[PDB]
Design a protein around this ligand. Structure first.
Ligand SMILES: *C(=O)CCCCCCCCCCCCC
Lengths: 546, 163
């Protein structure tokens, strides 16, 4: 997901502006749906939401626009249990043997014969929550087991939270409403309002441990792999209580990162840290936010956003529609150099030709260089010490960069990586002068629509995730609901698209209409005012009651 | 009853629901959403009710790509009656009304549907929905950043034998 909020100090009109570019599935229970909701006098909000929810999840109103991005905060903790030496169904807390609880569920199963049978399954539970088994990682043996405490299981406030956000007037009201209720499960919130404020909040339901407990309560080897794991044999490693938390065991709002600025805030699924590099967010719980190298989507956005030049609506739109493969910026120049150094090496010829002719984008017309580049990067990622300039904590926007071609072993490995990548691309059924758009598509009935964009791990802001299905890459997730909002005097001006269209049903007039538009990158007005709605020549109206 | 909505659709099937209260607003939302996505919701409700294996057998997967039976076990555990009931009793009147409207609006579309925009008309799993179903969907989304990511791990958690 991407989000950028621009404030009065940077926007071309001196007012708030918001780009919402969430990256979510194209199917299933998280498929975004557009709607505008109005109770005249007290609610008027438009955007998109998840299936089955009678609230707007990402949207805008008269003076406010907001959006969300999956955060890097922990929303659960694992608990390593010490098992009773006499009984692996018992576990020790403060050296006392407690029995596991057993909860059985019964499932009906349609057999081969079309008939139902009853399957009974036992779910083992500890005081923390249910046991979980990851074979070869989190086992249940005779000395240890792992249980999982999910912080959102007691979050009954989630729906009220979005209804409340839907009623928010401006950025300060939004902040109040989100900090008071703490109903947000697992996303950041970024927002801008008419008066030109830009807000980032890392305000979600996050397990709370007082700072002096963390080093002693952590399972050191598991936290190093990024798992929030705690010592479950010690009662003092229970989540801490703070009467200011909206829910017992969760982090108080005052302790979660917030940035209020008039220039910009951004997030691309990295931590709060470099939301705006001019004002780093630091000193938070490791369950909350850590200072880790940012992904290339964030690096890309910061390279466009830092500086003193005014930001237009078009600036932000084009950050998505450019389809620029930002990871190319770090490696392609040195990669092309290595290509020139090995001219007349038969194995590398086609790859280097394709790469040097490539527009560095994931556009429909982008050359096969993108395909060669992806497969190389997949191998590059597995190499040790191949960066010319490794990540530098003092230069976090500009590192890692370049290939260490001066180190002879690296040069050998990078070339072999390129040969291997070339081979894989050449083995596959890619035609001659076939383009990215010929390969990446979304199926609609018996037809196919070319989809621009590419994997966000390659720094394409317009992130698109695809899987191999037969002769094509089939899009499964990424850019989904797009909204870009500004605030001219008349009322909110909102622009965007729902990439995969309103309806998942092939029989619908709205199964592929916005998908056609997404293909051509033709964003549309999101009509909000009665006037905008009445100006629509396709306007239909139905009233219903029972 | 006391359910009323005014719905406008603009280009691309975007609904604009106007109502005088949460109940009517819910009613419009569920009706409009059902028009575009009745089958999706029905499928995901089946998943969230832990009824995949009942309708589809053990050889299929949910849209989250979990095997039907492990998925069912996880959702049957997650969405037990007491969890649903506690969750409901914690909802504000406004939210309760939103959900009641939605269920009622979805079911109204189901009553009237003739297949114009619904490909799963006739399937035994396309059924009238209840507020509990929306709570099931909500809770499934709630744990997407927690125990949801360990659904398989939970189903697999069994004590050691004689090894
Ligand atoms: C990018 O990270 C996409 C973020 C999309 C999140 C949608 C809004 C959050 C919805 C969660 C609601 C939980 C309902 C129980």
């Amino acid at each position: 997901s991407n989000a950028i909020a621009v404030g009065s100090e940077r926007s071309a009109d001196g007012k708030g502006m918001l780009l919402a570019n969430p990256h979510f599935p194209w199917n299933g229970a998280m498929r975004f749906y557009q709607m505008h909701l109005t109770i005249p006098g007290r609610l008027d909000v438009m955007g998109a939401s998840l299936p089955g929810l009678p609230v707007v999840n990402i949207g805008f109103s008269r003076h406010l626009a907001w959006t969300h991005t999956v955060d890097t905060s922990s929303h659960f903790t694992l608990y390593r249990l010490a098992l009773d030496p006499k009984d692996p169904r018992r576990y020790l807390v403060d050296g006392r043997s407690l029995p596991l609880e057993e909860k059985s569920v019964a499932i009906e199963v349609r057999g081969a014969d079309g008939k139902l049978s009853r399957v009974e399954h036992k779910v083992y539970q500890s005081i923390y929550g249910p046991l979980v088994v990851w074979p070869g990682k989190l086992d249940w043996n005779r000395s240890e087991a792992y249980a999982l405490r999910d912080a959102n299981l007691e979050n009954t406030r989630v729906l009220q939270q979005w209804y409340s956000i839907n009623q928010a007037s401006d950025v300060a009201d939004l902040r109040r409403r989100v900090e008071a209720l703490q109903g947000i499960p697992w996303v950041n919130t970024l927002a801008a309002d008419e008066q030109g404020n830009a807000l980032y909040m890392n305000q979600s339901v996050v397990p709370y441990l007082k700072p002096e407990l963390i080093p002693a309560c952590a399972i050191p080897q598991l936290v190093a792999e990024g798992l929030p794991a705690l010592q479950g044999q010690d009662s003092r490693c229970a989540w801490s209580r703070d009467p200011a938390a909206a829910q017992a065991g969760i982090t108080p709002a005052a302790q979660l990162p917030v940035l209020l600025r008039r220039d910009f805030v951004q997030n691309s699924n990295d931590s709060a840290w470099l939301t705006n590099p001019a004002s780093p967010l630091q000193g938070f719980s490791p369950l909350v936010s850590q200072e880790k190298p940012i992904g290339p989507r964030a690096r890309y956005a910061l390279s466009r956003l830092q500086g003193k030049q005014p930001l237009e609506a078009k600036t932000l739109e084009e950050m998505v529609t450019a389809n620029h493969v930002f990871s190319a910026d770090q490696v392609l120049p040195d990669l092309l150099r290595l290509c020139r150094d090995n001219q007349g090496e038969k194995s590398l010829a086609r790859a280097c030709a394709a790469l040097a002719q490539w527009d560095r984008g994931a556009n429909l017309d982008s050359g096969s260089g993108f395909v060669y580049f992806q497969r190389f990067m997949q191998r590059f990622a597995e190499l040790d010490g191949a960066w010319k300039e490794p990540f530098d904590a003092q230069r976090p926007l500009d590192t890692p960069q370049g290939i260490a071609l001066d180190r002879p072993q690296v040069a050998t490995q990078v070339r072999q990586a390129l040969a291997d990548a070339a081979a894989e691309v050449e083995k596959s059924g890619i035609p001659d002068g076939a383009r990215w758009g010929d390969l990446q598509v979304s199926t609609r009935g018996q037809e196919r629509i070319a989809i621009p964009g590419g994997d966000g791990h390659f720094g394409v802001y317009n992130a698109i995730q695809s899987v191999r299905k037969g002769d094509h890459l089939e899009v499964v997730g990424g850019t989904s609901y797009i909204q870009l909002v500004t605030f001219p005097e008349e009322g909110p001006k909102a622009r965007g698209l729902l990439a995969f269209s309103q309806s998942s049903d092939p029989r619908s007039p709205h199964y592929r209409d916005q998908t056609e538009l997404f293909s051509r990158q033709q964003w549309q007005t999101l009509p909000f005012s009665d006037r905008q709605i009445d100006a629509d020549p396709q306007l239909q109206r139905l009233s219903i009651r029972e | 009853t006391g359910l009323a909505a005014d719905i406008r659709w603009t280009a691309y099937g975007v609904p604009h629901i106007r109502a005088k209260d949460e109940r009517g607003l819910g009613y419009g939302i569920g009706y409009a959403y059902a028009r575009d996505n009745a089958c999706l919701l029905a499928e995901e409700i089946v998943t969230a009710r832990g009824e995949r294996a009942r309708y589809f057998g053990s050889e299929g997967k949910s849209s989250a790509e979990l095997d039907n039976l492990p998925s069912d076990i996880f959702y049957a555990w997650l969405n037990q009656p007491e969890a649903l009931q506690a969750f409901w009793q914690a909802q504000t009147p406004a939210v309760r009304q939103l959900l009641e409207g939605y269920a009622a609006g979805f079911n109204r579309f189901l009553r009237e549907a003739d297949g114009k925009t619904t490909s799963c008309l006739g399937q035994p799993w396309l059924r009238a929905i209840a507020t509990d179903d929306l709570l099931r969907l909500t809770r499934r989304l709630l744990v997407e950043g927690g125990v949801g990511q360990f659904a398989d791990a939970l189903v697999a958690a069994a004590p050691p034998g004689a090894e």
